[PDB]
Amino acid sequence: ALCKFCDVRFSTCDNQKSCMSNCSITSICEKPQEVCVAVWRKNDENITLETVCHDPKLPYHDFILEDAASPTCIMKEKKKPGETFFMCSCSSDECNDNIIFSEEY
Q: CA–CA separation, 95 vs 62, rounded Å?
């Protein structure tokens, strides 16, 4: 897989139906089973977007990437203290470059 892989970066993505990662690093994931991941987090000081490759047989942020087979990165909210946290994974080229905050489409 080819994925955006900037780790955790500041983001201005907020209150939008979709956002671009604005990550300038597209990497070949080390292992063929890895998929793309995006994690959007907002606290009272800032917003970040994390982009990585990850093996979906392993948990990430204490969750299983149950959506790894999806070609698109559909953000879904997770329960975490002191912040708003959304995550998605996907398995098409650079798919974590475009994060979608809804299932409506």
A: 22
Range of the domain at 47: 1-105
Residue with tokens 């047989």: 57
Report strand pairing: 2-4 vs 26-28: antiparallel
Are 76 and 70 contacting, i.e. CB atoms less than 8 angstroms apart? no
State whether the Cα torsion 29-92-79-25 is positive or negative.
positive
Method used to obtain the model: X-ray
- Strand 73-74 relative to strand 98-100, pairing: parallel
Q: Is 5 helix (H, G, I), strand (E, B) or coil?
A: coil
CATH at 72 = 2.10.60.10
Q: What's the rounded Cα separation, in Å, for the pair 37 and 50?
A: 8
